[PDB]
Design a protein around this ligand. Sequence first.
Ligand SMILES: Nc1ncnc2c1ncn2[C@@H]1O[C@H](COP(=O)(O)OP(=O)(O)O)[C@@H](O)[C@H]1O
Ligand SMILES: [Mg+2]
Ligand SMILES: [Mg+2]
Ligand SMILES: [Zn+2]
Length: 251
Amino acid sequence: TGEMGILWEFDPIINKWIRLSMKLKVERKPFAEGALREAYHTVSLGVGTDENYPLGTTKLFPPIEMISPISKNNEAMTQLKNGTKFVLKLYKKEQQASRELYFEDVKMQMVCRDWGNKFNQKKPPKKIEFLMSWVVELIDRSPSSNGQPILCSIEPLLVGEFKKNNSNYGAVLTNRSTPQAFSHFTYELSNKQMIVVDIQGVDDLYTDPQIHTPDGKGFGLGNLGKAGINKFITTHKCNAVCALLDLDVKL
Ligand SMILES: Nc1ncnc2c1ncn2[C@@H]1O[C@H](COP(=O)(O)OP(=O)(O)O)[C@@H](O)[C@H]1O
Ligand SMILES: [Mg+2]
Ligand SMILES: [Mg+2]
Ligand SMILES: [Zn+2]
């Protein structure tokens, strides 16, 4: 039959969240799992507005000043339109997850999308793209728990061979140039204030990346700070794409 959700889209250029609704139908069992999450095949039963589901309240997160009152322009209306097959992700059985973490995870994926666009403006041999991600509140479910409402993230379905190219702790898992050159690009151009790793997906369409920052603050559970940054440095070998972008040989 399906279930309702409040759907949240972040737009970095206006620095605001857009609040929508959708109906979806999720398979009972996951098709894949990672270190932290389980992934479920899902179908869209349509995207709509949030008009029927008022915010009310204060404790509100995101805070009201961070939400656009207008939602007419969005990615969800196209990318999650009625009939679309996509992916829903839940944290495995959890304790360290707050409401804020889900939004932080989605914002992080959006920040990576901006880095992808920045990398592409340099005219690399292979352009890259990160998938959209959204927060969904599964408002038809009881809170179970703990009493906490049920949240998840959703993303488009990748079709093809899913491959991890690097991890968030120094592993270089494939021999391809582009994913490693991009990680290096983000480190140099950010004045070493961040790096994008966990570059994974189908060809150069990536998802669930991870950012480290020197102070380790923000960017979710997987931000391993200076330690994560140094691990990347220890195993990074510059390649033909690094050289084309004129990246520093010393990190
Ligand atoms: N958008 C997607 N489309 C298809 N399969 C996916 C997608 N995202 C993740 N997967 C699969 O689900 C697994 C778990 O996803 P996730 O926890 O996000 O990544 P990780 O592999 O870093 O743990 C992945 O290893 C991959 O096999
Ligand atoms: Mg991540
Ligand atoms: Mg953190
Ligand atoms: Zn390099």
